Ligand binder design. Structure first.
Ligand code: G5X
Length: 291
């Protein structure tokens, strides 16, 4: 069976043993792509972690799990959710990771209005993560507000690498159709070989998400909106009156159809709009735990 082959392959990269021997008090906090995310306690230290458990028999692309456990293990960056361990518990792959108590960014963009200082803080954090990640040939391929987690004190970390991939000098592009439809880049939906630039476009969409509270064509069906992204010009902000010229100039360097002229993360780190970025304390009030 291909299933047992995949189990045995995971045993070569997964941490040995049973995690249920030092983790307890599972509190379900997330669902989705046939994988539940729980909060757990570490018996040794009492610290809290997040455990993503994915059933291997219910996956459209099992290989991506591979990616997530291989690319992200030993990865350390202040703006990236750190993975500590991974385990194979029966037919379930468990990923043990840092627990972000502040929740996701979607919860903020659907309930409140963010200012340009906070938007610039979020973007600076995401771009600092992305410059390193792309320098190592890692493409997140699912940049959206759901993939942004926060601490209680307002620190921003990138998360949900379940679609990520790696490119090299030998293999510099991907051709798979992954991501969430409304955030996908034009070259990606157009079945074109793409590189890290798709992460920039998606970041741009998230900026729209932080301005308008939703991505473009959110009302349309997924495939219809994907065709619209494929054919139409770069989408324009609905709440265009609320954004400063600096933010519009920043966003224009992100939502470029041609990936060759789309700005890179390293370039965007030099943009003046990110000077508006505030400290994590500026994100503290946006949190749901208050307001
Ligand atoms: N479905 C949900 O609701 C999720 C909730 N969290 C968390 C996690 C921690 N803290 C909070 N507050 N939420 C998720 C984390 C991921 C993930 C990931 C990685 O790729 C990140 C890099 C290292 C390997 C693993 C996927 C989904 C959810």
């Amino acid at each position: 069976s291909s299933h047992e082959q995949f189990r045995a392959a995971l045993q070569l990269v997964v941490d040995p043993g049973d995690p249920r021997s030092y983790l307890d008090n599972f509190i379900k906090i997330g669902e989705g792509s046939t994988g539940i995310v729980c909060i757990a306690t570490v018996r040794s230290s009492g610290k809290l972690v997040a455990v993503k458990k994915m059933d291997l028999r219910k996956q459209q692309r099992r290989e991506l799990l591979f990616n997530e456990v291989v690319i992200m293990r030993d990865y350390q960056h202040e703006n990236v959710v750190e993975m500590y361990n991974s385990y194979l518990v029966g037919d379930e792959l468990w990923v043990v990771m840092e627990f972000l108590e502040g929740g996701a960014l979607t919860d903020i963009v659907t309930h409140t209005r963010m200012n340009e200082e906070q938007i610039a803080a979020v973007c600076l954090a995401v771009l600092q993560a992305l410059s390193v990640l792309h320098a190592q040939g890692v493409i997140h391929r699912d940049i959206k507000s759901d993939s942004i987690l926060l601490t209680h004190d307002g620190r921003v970390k990138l998360s949900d690498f379940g679609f990520c991939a790696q490119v090299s000098k030998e293999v510099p592009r991907r051709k798979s159709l992954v991501g969430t439809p409304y955030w996908m880049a034009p070259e990606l939906i157009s079945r074109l070989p793409y590189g890290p630039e798709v992460d920039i476009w998606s970041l741009g969409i998230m900026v729209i998400e932080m301005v308008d509270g939703e991505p473009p064509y959110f009302n349309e069906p997924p495939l219809k909106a994907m065709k619209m992204i494929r054919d139409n010009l770069p989408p324009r902000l609905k709440n265009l009156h609320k954004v400063s010229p600096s933010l519009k100039g920043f966003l224009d360097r992100l939502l470029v159809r041609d990936p060759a002229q789309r700005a890179t993360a390293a370039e965007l780190l030099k943009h003046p709009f990110l000077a508006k970025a505030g400290p994590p304390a500026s994100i503290v009030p946006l949190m749901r735990q208050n307001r």
